Amino acid sequence: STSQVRQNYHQDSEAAINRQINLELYASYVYLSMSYYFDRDDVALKNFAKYFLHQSHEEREHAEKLMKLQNQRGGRIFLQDIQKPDCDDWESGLNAMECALHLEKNVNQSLLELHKLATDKNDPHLCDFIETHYLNEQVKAIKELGDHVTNLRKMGAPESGLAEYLFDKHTLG
Amino acid sequence: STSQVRQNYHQDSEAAINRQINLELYASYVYLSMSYYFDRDDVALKNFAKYFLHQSHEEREHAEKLMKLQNQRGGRIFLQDIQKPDCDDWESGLNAMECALHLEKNVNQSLLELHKLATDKNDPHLCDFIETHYLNEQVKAIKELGDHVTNLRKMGAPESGLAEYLFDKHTLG
Amino acid sequence: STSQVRQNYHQDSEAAINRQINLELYASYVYLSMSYYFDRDDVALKNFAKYFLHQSHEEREHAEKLMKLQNQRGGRIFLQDIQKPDCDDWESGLNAMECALHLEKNVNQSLLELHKLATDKNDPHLCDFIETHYLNEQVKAIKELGDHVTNLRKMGAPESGLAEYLFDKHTLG
Amino acid sequence: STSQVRQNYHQDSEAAINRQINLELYASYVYLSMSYYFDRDDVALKNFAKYFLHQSHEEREHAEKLMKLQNQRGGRIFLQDIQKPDCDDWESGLNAMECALHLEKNVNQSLLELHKLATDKNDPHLCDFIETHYLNEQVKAIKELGDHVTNLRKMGAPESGLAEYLFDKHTLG
Amino acid sequence: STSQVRQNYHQDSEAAINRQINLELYASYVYLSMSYYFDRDDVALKNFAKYFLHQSHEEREHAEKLMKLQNQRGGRIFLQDIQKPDCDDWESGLNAMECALHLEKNVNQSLLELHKLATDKNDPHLCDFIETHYLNEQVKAIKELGDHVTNLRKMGAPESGLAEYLFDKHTLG
Amino acid sequence: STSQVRQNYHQDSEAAINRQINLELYASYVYLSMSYYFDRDDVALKNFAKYFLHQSHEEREHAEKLMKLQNQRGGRIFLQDIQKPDCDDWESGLNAMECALHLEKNVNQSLLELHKLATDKNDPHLCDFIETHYLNEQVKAIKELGDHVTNLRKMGAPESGLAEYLFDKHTLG
Ligand code: NA
Ligand code: NA
Ligand code: NA
Ligand code: NA
Ligand code: NA
Numbered sequence A, B, C, D, E, F: 001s002t003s004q005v006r007q008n009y010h011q012d013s014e015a016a017i018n019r020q021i022n023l024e025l026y027a028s029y030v031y032l033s034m035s036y037y038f039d040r041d042d043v044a045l046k047n048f049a050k051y052f053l054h055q056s057h058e059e060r061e062h063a064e065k066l067m068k069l070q071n072q073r074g075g076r077i078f079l080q081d082i083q084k085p086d087c088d089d090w091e092s093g094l095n096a097m098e099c100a101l102h103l104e105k106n107v108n109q110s111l112l113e114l115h116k117l118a119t120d121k122n123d124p125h126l127c128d129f130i131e132t133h134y135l136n137e138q139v140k141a142i143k144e145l146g147d148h149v150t151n152l153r154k155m156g157a158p159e160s161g162l163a164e165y166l167f168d169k170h171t172l173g
């Protein structure tokens, strides 16, 4: 049952990739939830909605790239349930950005653990894959979300509705 | 005196269409009133004025489409007086948007009653006409006005003149 | 309560402008009625319908220009009910053109009274506005309608259905 | 023998669609007959001929769309004989337009019965298909033919050969 | 807590839309699973992979449109876990197409139940939404999958590897 | 009652043209039946469907050209019922092509009899019409269908579903 393509690809690496697929799909779902919160008539921040929908689609692309990797290396994809997000109501633009920052840091931690595993199993292709496609993307995402949180806080969010309105227009628009 | 084209078109449907024509013309007049309120030198919100004038013209188009339908089906148009709007002075951008939301919901209720009548009289052409041309347009209008009211309220309208100014520029501009 | 912009604008002038707004809106409604008469399956003169719809839209533009003037001068718009037209059935192309000619002459008489008022109140801006935007437009409209009535009568309308058909095609098309 | 695609598609609906196919093919044949009547050297109204040929081709397209629907839903097409039209000689442009109006109203009645059946069998796809593709097309056709009959009658057809000549040129050309 | 936009939108309808969102997301996940099965080195049917990935993305779009509808009507989105697909290994191109056909028929049945609910609750906007955006799309999908299953079976799949190869090239390519 | 245009046009020729019109319309209907057989979900050969629909439309054009001829010569068109095709289910691509070949040979035989009649009645215009517009078209059609039957038989149709699939793609596509 060993794939004809498989070479230097540890069972532990294969399992870790399957976990990461699920995590990326989860993140996609979280961002989808956040997007449609901002689309509510009682929230009505269209550029927050657009921002989070974009992130949702990006996370799905990240999951699909891991699925491609799994097959390229001769591993086998095992999908699991995608858990529902922790919240239905995301409270405010600031709260959502803070939740996103926490999520991105959790995803980054998982990727750092995957890189460590790849290094420990002497799998340089996998290590390089993670470095090239995932780690700088995560650092950039985290920096962007931190910048957003800083700006929102400085502007007076979430108490000032005018802050979120103007941030939506000027930063996210 | 029965029209050569008339088929499956109940007298009650014909009467309901004449009522809806009047209601659309009324709505057009309300929006016209609102438009020119915002054009006053002591109000001076040009994009509110433009928004409501556009809505006025759209409502007139809606009325004319119903008039076309009446003739297409072999009904006879009977026009009535167009009543003056309830207010001359619309107080604020927020108050006008709230009044518009109420108006749109009243128009939607009338269209839902018309659809029910068409269904009750087994007039699928009329039911389809209302679904295709009126019902989603109303849902969209109501959602847009609700979004506007939410944003204005969050920004601090009507107490903050700066709120209405910035909404006029950034949302309606 | 005097507008910051108001200068040399008499209360009687302001009232006369509000009356003229109503008259223009009334004329728009009359022409709308006439338009849709010609769209009936038992009348079926598409170019008569188009002609009168154009006139309807033009009269609305005339009303809106007066509303703009009212605000430019610091007067206050007071809308009134728009009365229904005198007829539902306009009988013939010739009869409608004759009714239009009568309407246009009534509107012109009202504008001449407004000009006289402006002159009497030493309001040269208002007098000029009426001269520039309204009086030659009315003279042209009246001359055009008179030409149409003459042609229809000479061709044998309304007794000849062939007359109205050919006029619809060759003059109004 | 149940199609793998079939879902929510009643035997009565399938039968009614087969009847409607035949009716559309019949209508196509009627219009073909009318077309070539106008092409006769002793009739010689080329634009009447063109008008009816266009209608013939349109009715065939309508039949083919129903055949497509039958297969989409997993029903089975059963064709029947296409009966010859009621007349060989259509007498006049006015008489043909009156016969067309009668035909279109008969087709519309059949479509309204089909819609009622679809609604009674809780087949919303079929009901929507009929509403979307057939009912407004029929209302428009009926209104157009009524307009044509009105104009021809007003112009003096069929006694005036000049009426049909000019209608052929100016309306149908 | 009633939304300012909500009108004629039953709690049962809102709940049914939330169920349909989950079902569409589930279908998206199934198709994703199927896609990456065909990308395996021991399966290696690139056009099957592309076909199912396209379907996955389409189902996600369908889910997002329902989420938009929920907010447009003033309902509240409640997400649930996305269950993992029933299979990890989809056996063959034919087996996957058969599983897809079964899935599409299940989704269609759910949409027909939603339409019945909308009709029962006199919600014509919702009924129209389902008819316009979902029901013909499902009929087309089901017909396409049935055609694919027929062709694969006729060609000798799944026993003939040459059948799936050639179908992949000529139909899906 | 003799047409003003009629010259050298025998009553027997006129009758034979009316028979040929019916035969062409019949052939059109046969091909229509065949087309929609191939569109069935349990047959699913789209290029066979397209091929036969094209032939259906071509046969209708042939019928209309004969109708034009009848009027050009001052004959009078008498339409008859269009009989339903002999089969509802055409069994296979090969069987349909064989049935088409038989049909085309039957149509050709009728045209050869018409040419013989024209020659016997010293009607060179009619003979030339048939030669120019019909006889080479029939020879080409017969040769094409024979080629198709040969290829299908050589490839292993109808027992090989792979044969019809590949013929559909490579010859008819
Ligand atoms: Na990611
Ligand atoms: Na409206
Ligand atoms: Na509909
Ligand atoms: Na005027
Ligand atoms: Na039709």
Ligand code: NA
Residues within 6 Å of the ligand: E024, E027, E058, E059, E062, E107
């Ligand atoms: Na779907």
Ligand code: NA
Residues within 6 Å of the ligand: F024, F027, F058, F059, F062, F107
């Ligand atoms: Na032929």
